[PDB]
Amino acid sequence: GLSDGEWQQVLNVWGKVEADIAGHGQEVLIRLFTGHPETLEKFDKFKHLKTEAEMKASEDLKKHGTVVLTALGGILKKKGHHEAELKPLAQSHATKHKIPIKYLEFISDAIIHVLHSKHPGDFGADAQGAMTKALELFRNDIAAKYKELGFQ
Ligand code: HEM
């Protein structure tokens, strides 16, 4: 449950991401994969990436980063009214990709890390609070769908 002012902060922060969705998406995934190498194993199409240099050079990783952040941005712009947008992602990530909710926590924190890394001094405490709450809401609603599906 975010206030109007918190959603305003979220969407203000998101404008930073939308200016360079592929660069943000790439860095989010690289942060996820390098911080939590087990997550790489969930991607048949990225498990060949042995080094961060290879990850950085991967155009397909940037492409997927764009897909991920485009989806997330579409969800965030719903300001919590995202059941229709979230449902297929929860279902695909539980049933097809088999992504534990822990990895969604990892990527949520990776987003925060990337925002500070790319916008140092420009991702204020209020913005971090609002973005964190929005990612918690996202993760929590996914978690509810995971529970429905019995997925761990
Ligand atoms: C912000 C959180 C995430 C968003 C918005 C997101 C979004 C997406 C989207 C839109 C797709 C393609 C459509 C689909 O298959 O449903 C996808 C595919 C996929 N996602 Fe995610 N995802 C997120 C987090 C994760 C995490 C944390 C993992 C694993 C650690 C993961 C693993 C995968 C895999 C393996 C695929 C299939 C990739 C392929 O083979 O093309 N996702 N994701």
UniProtKB/Swiss-Prot annotation:
Superkingdom, taxonomy of origin: Eukaryota
EC numbers, comma separated: 1.7.-.-, 1.11.1.-
Primary localisation category: cytoplasm
Phosphoserine modifications at: S3
Cysteine pairs bridged by disulfides in the record: none
InterPro entries in the cross-refs: Globin, Globin-like_sf, Myoglobin
Protein name, UniProt field: Myoglobin
